[PDB]
Write an enzyme that holds these catalytic residues in place. Sequence first.
Site, PDB file in Angstrom:
ATOM      1  N   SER A  62       0.787  -1.295   0.099  1.00  0.00           N
ATOM      2  CA  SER A  62      -0.085  -0.077   0.085  1.00  0.00           C
ATOM      3  C   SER A  62       0.771   1.259   0.158  1.00  0.00           C
ATOM      4  O   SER A  62       1.493   1.729  -1.045  1.00  0.00           O
ATOM      5  CB  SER A  62      -1.029  -0.420   1.186  1.00  0.00           C
ATOM      6  N   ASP A  66      -9.143  -5.339  -5.808  1.00  0.00           N
ATOM      7  CA  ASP A  66      -8.787  -4.424  -4.846  1.00  0.00           C
ATOM      8  C   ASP A  66      -9.643  -3.280  -4.987  1.00  0.00           C
ATOM      9  O   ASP A  66      -9.555  -2.575  -5.991  1.00  0.00           O
ATOM     10  CB  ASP A  66      -7.225  -4.093  -4.982  1.00  0.00           C
ATOM     11  N   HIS A 122      -7.547  -5.527  -1.269  1.00  0.00           N
ATOM     12  CA  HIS A 122      -6.329  -4.918  -0.581  1.00  0.00           C
ATOM     13  C   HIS A 122      -5.422  -5.654   0.057  1.00  0.00           C
ATOM     14  O   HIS A 122      -4.130  -5.521   0.201  1.00  0.00           O
ATOM     15  CB  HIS A 122      -6.692  -3.756  -0.134  1.00  0.00           C
TER      16      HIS A 122
END
Lengths: 825, 822
Positions: free
Chosen positions: A691, A769, A801
């Site tokens: 991320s 995601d 995610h």
Amino acid sequence: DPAARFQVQKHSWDGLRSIIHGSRKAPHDFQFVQKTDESGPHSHRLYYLGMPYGSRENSLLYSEIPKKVRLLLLSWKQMLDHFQATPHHGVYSREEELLRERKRLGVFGITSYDFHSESGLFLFQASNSLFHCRDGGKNGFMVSPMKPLEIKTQCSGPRMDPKICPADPAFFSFINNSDLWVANIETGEERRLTFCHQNVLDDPKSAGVATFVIQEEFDRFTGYWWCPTASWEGSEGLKTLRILYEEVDESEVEVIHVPSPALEERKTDSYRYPRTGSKNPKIALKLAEFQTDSQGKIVSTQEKELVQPFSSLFPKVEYIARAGWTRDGKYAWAMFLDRPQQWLQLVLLPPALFIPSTENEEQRLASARAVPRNVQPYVVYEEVTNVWINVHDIFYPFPQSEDELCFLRANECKTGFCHLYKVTAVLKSQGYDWSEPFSPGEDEFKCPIKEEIALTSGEWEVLARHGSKIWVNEETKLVYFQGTKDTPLEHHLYVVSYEAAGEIVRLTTPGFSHSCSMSQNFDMFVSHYSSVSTPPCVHVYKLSGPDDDPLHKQPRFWASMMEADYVPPEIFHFHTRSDVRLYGMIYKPHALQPGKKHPTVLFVYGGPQVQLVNNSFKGIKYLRLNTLASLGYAVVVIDGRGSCQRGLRFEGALKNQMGQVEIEDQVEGLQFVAEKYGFIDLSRVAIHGWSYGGFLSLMGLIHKPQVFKVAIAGAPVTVWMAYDTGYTERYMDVPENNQHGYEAGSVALHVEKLPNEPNRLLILHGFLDENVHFFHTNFLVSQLIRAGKPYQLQIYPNERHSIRCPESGEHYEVTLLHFLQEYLH
Amino acid sequence: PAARFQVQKHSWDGLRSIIHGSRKKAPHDFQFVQKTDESGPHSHRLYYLGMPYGSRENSLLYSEIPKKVRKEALLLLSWKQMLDHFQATPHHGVYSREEELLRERKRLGVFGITSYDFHSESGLFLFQASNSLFHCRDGGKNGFMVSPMKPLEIKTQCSGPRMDPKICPADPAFFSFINNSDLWVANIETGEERRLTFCHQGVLDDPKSAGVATFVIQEEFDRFTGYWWCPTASWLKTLRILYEEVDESEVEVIHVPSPALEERKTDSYRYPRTGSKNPKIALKLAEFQTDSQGKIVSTQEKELVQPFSSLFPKVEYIARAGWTRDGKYAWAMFLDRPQQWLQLVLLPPALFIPSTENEEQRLASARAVPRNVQPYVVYEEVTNVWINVHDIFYPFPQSEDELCFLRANECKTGFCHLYKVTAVLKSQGYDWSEPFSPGEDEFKCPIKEEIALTSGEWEVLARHGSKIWVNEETKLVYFQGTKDTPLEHHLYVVSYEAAGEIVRLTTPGFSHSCSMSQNFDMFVSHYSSVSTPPCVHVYKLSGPDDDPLHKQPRFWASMMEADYVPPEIFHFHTRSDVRLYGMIYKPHALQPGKKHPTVLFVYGGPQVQLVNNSFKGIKYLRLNTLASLGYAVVVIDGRGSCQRGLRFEGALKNQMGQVEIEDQVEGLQFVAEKYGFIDLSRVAIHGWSYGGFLSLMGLIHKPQVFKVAIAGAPVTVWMAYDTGYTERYMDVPENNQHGYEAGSVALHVEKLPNEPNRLLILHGFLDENVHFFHTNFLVSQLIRAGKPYQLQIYPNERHSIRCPESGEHYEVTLLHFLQEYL
Ligand SMILES: *C(#N)[C]1[C][C](F)[C]N1C(=O)[C]([N])[C]1[C][C][C][C][C]1
Ligand SMILES: *C(#N)[C]1[C][C](F)[C]N1C(=O)[C]([N])[C]1[C][C][C][C][C]1
């Protein structure tokens, strides 16, 4: 130089698979209930959610707390009798799966439940449906488990967000198809209260719902709040019940498509996703009444709205962060925020301020004239800053004894650290002609502050986010809270008098970090605690001593609930060239031979609202870092400037220059680790993170190519323009206001600076995601092709995610090992 | 030992410069027009589409054919411009959604004008350009210009693109188009427009369309149009358009990403997957009346007197349609769902009655249709293998009660050949007012005769734009074929009167793409060889007018002329005595005795022949580039490939993947013994689409043969591919569970390698033919089995890598993957 460099052993792919397979081969959500029976052996029943080692799924459990102990281990008694809460093959509904993503819920089964103590009614989601059971109170205490009774429904689709009515446990509420419903658990009667929802993009109105950005970026998982008490207004004695609620219109919010989990179908799902700069939803607080007879029949229902518009009364407000009511039901309240997130307002909203909605222009002015002149919004608090408002959950209004309001409030912007204050706001009615239309001034409803006492102070924070909360005792005048006063690396339970801001007493043992939960009777607490070196325990501490000084109740260990080639890391710290203390973590290579220099993996996250480096057990979530260490990798983690737990100014180094500060601190940490510990080969450093960490991995490779040899960027943020309003605008401003910073911090725009050499960049991304859209990777690849640049890529087709499915997870770890083995040289 | 030739290992910058160093359309769509002027120096004007070497875009051009040429000098014709400084390509090469998708369905790589319509008597040119419509006038009544003229844009009140423009043959004042999935008509002279169909409204709620070729019809049946002008007018005067009306309601929807990646949106698509429902279809008729002033007076929507599903119960696809030249009958080419039964059906205009929602009005018109009027099934092609759709169908004018036509037919003998056919149209008499149920062979005309004009172990070309030219004075049919050899297309002529001597008009040693004058006095041949680049020459047919079959083609003039080392075609026999043809690129600067690493470049699916005698250096430059670095590149046309007739192609039937690799391995082992330079220890398999599918099948079933695999846009699950292609070769899933499973590379992922660096997957993200799903689902299953892979995405690319920068990146990656890992 030759014998000095440690060469990692090169395994085949099946070899790495067996390595990853070999490596991989707690009680929460508490309710303390006192037993009113002196003849029995147990003082309390402690109810909780928990997953036993043998069990697949999370479930409702209980332990019996004894009256006297002679090391006790408490039994985990089952509540529901051979009950599967998880649906067939772990396949949730779309709404329920998305709630689990927004709450980061890795575990299957019952993840929330609602409880009403007097009646002893438990209410919860299960099997893509609603369920309930009764224990304690009028029903009595069971020995053996009871089957949970399913609640029947005429509604189609999921029933989201069940809550028992506090004023009457016969009643409960839910969301079905983006509208507020209510129902009677005893009689089976259901009633719809809002009518915002009907097709798809053609159907933009919703009621009782927290939207995406609210769930994901403001940590609010609900947009309706029960009034805690009942009125008895009417002609012939009917009881009235109220629900404050957020109404939402998403018409002008941009749509994006994300792929469905059903890959064979080859479809997407549509989604209102407010990108930074673009329009967030048009919002409102509304009110919903419904009356009940003595038989529990729902007689009438009413839709109320504010006497003036929400956009006129509160013209600068962009998001509703939080809401609820006073304990007596006198005022609803809300926590508002402007679009920059630099101005917050705690606003009281009296029920009389709300009038019935009608489409007729004549009727509305009649009801508007009928509202008292004295009635109005009361802005009791106003937090302002040059940095940003982090939303802090703590707001405890004391019941009034009219014309003023005493409350506790967590506030960070005053001094730069989050601290408790007692505040008295002065409620004085200006008098308003609510029929004639109305333009508020800059401080229109702002109550004068009579006093504002600091209860806590120093270079440390009270915890008020991600489920942290206070417990307030009104007999003894003590406020129990959690904080970092001892150290940033350990959470601890403290107590302080809100009457007399004197000695803060620590109730948890030092050398461990603590996640605590208090009895509402204040006689005992649980702490789920751990350290870097030791796995987590869950202990029950009883608060004991003379009642004449309740501040100094000594916490005595009562009983325990949970107890107990992994080598823990070592916390360290160091100072930057600018004299800022940064904390770090190192996992040393297993069976280290001094004089050898080893290849190094800089594991990174580095974004706001995370601290990686603290004194709690890492081997659950970060087993892979130990597995790396088992092969002979040095693994280093640095909490640079930006990270949380160090107050606003430390966090605030990010402001309008994400990407710019973080890598410098990471380089400094890596170079510090090199000098202190003799085993880092700086010629063989790899940067790796998911991320924000993937974003930083790319920034490391762009700006420091002589430092980092490879980069394994997972789900990276490549274009800040493609991320949402709530997160991005808070740290980076709107795009038209920060062109230089958005560009400088967007790794996709600096692709010329990425390496000409192949085998130095591995990209990873989940196809499904819905947080960081696969677009980010797609667009990075698009730009990598345009610049003529090599890359490797891995997709996770059935993963959002986070990589939840274990087989995907093991494959991810095997790939990483291979990429480092072959290419980190 | 020292024998193994090791490729030189370059850095990535090095490979980039190599690929950049290597890389640093011919006249087509011809129209012969005679000059009607004995005093002037030119006999013809040849109109055509073309792209000069300097120019960016394709454009409308002409050359002047002279009356006499000097036979000492080789005369080169000038490419004169038609349009005066006109950009046909839209701003930044960004077409509309409909027009971009038509270019994907047609494989049109080139920018600018890709099609045009011409009307010969008036000299009217009509064509799409600038996401709009345009026209200009030259020849005929307008007369022949020297310098170019600006093309006049046609104004319109329609919003969105105007697709598929066609001039009305009966009246060049009129033209037609598609706007928003409905048929429109307009008057070019007066500017009047009129909509004729009302299927589309204002895209899941709106499934009906009129005049439109659907996805599977474009992609898998080579039809890019769903409406056909009647060629004559009845008498105010009426003009007619036959049209396919289409309902896509029961056809499954799929979502594909938009070119605008920033938007993060998809587009919905009716995609009939194999086994699932194709569209509900129908032929309808749209009439419109005109006054002497060119005003459109009235319009009518007509439908068949009985339903399409009742008259033609077994018909699933409309392959082709049109009309007889006199306008007497419309006609259609139908097919069943298995694609083993085709019908040529004539449809009289009187068979169609006005559509009405009133039952009384419908029965008035239904009673009024004559009893003798009906459908006439003039032909029926049937087979155990499958019906390939062949374009050739030339109805002769009726010199009533019978019909003479020429028809290309493959199923009779197993090779596609021309036949003259006489069907007897005898009126059975039908009570059209009462409904009824047709059985099998209901409208089957008796065949009076069926004479073979051509025969042998070779084929007449009738697909992918091939066509015949028929001269009715001299009774000759000109056509193209493989009579000399499978490796060369050639022009032949034969008498339809007397099935005798086939005469070859093109020189041997080259493959030819020909186009005839409708006056039959001269032809163009755009021809080439493996060893020599392509030319475009103008040949004049000369000789005595009493013996037209033996007109000797004499070279008149030329239009186009021309470290590349061409490959060498070879052939060999399998263990079962089947002749396979193959192509090898030898390593450049070869030292015999050295054994070199090898790339088996593969396609291997139906409807393609890679190995023939034409120039490969344009389209397959990368194979020469591979050879320049010291790779052996081998190409094998295995069983299943086209140009070899039906039985060779039919080796695939219900077992795709199973036969093809064996032939590829046999060819690779043959190449090893014949040519002394193959190191079979270092063989890579590489291909796109079917080739990617086969590259994966090679790795699965022959891992000891192939060390690596670079699978581009592969077909990994046959269940996810369409109806039209898949059902034809592999049947429905319910009928061939064993074959669908056996031929799905995603289901045999356990058999893929445990060792990494042996599989490179490549796929275009915007691929609307072979959906990225295929790669996605292969990766999903690769993760489940615990299997290594490498992957490359093309985010701005559909089924082909069109953008040059993407293309260069693709080639650089391949070189690096081969360099390091082979
Ligand atoms: C990651 N992580 C993504 C992209 C960006 F870095 C921020 N982000 C988030 O998930 C945030 N929504 C979370 C805010 C709450 C606490 C963790 C990060
Ligand atoms: C590729 N090529 C894809 C997938 C499979 F191999 C078939 N295919 C096609 O594009 C076909 N629809 C083409 C039909 C016309 C001639 C070439 C193949």
